[PDB]
Design a protein around this ligand. Structure first.
Ligand SMILES: *[C@@H]1O[C@H](CO)[C@@H](O)[C@H](O)[C@H]1NC(C)=O
Lengths: 65, 65
């Protein structure tokens, strides 16, 4: 609907909020003293697709025609 | 026309023509070529060139009644 709102049209008409899934980063801050750190136990393999337009046809125009 | 010695020559025009022309410094035409006297003449008028360098020249069109 705009402004972070969404319309749920499954059972009856409801207006909810949108959220987004939170991601992480690959930069690890350096360990300079003894402390706690949070290491992963396992990983999920993920495929992400990305489309980018590169081409068009050319045109020749006879504007008198 | 009275024959002398020759005679005044005559040409009845039947249709409208296109002609490519080259002018000199003073604006007087010093070189022409009719656009329908041949195949190369039509390409000369399409490109506005008398001496056509080699290339690929697109979208020449055929007229139909
Ligand atoms: C164009 O006119 C100039 C003088 O204005 C003279 O050099 C010559 O008649 C023409 N030159 C070319 C390159 O067409």
């Amino acid at each position: 609907l705009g402004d972070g709102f969404c319309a749920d049209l499954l059972s009856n008409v409801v207006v909810r909020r949108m959220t987004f899934e939170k991601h992480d980063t690959t930069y690890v801050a350096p360990v300079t003293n003894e402390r706690f750190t949070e290491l992963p136990l396992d990983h999920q393999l993920v495929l992400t697709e990305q489309f980018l337009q590169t081409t068009m046809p050319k045109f020749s125009i006879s504007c008198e025609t | 026309g009275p024959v002398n010695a020759r005679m005044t020559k005559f040409n009845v025009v039947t249709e409208i023509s296109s002609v490519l022309v080259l002018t000199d410094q003073s604006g007087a035409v010093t070189r022409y070529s009719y656009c329908a006297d041949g195949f190369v003449n039509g390409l000369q008028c399409k490109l506005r060139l008398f001496d056509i360098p080699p290339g690929v020249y697109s979208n020449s069109e055929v007229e139909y009644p």
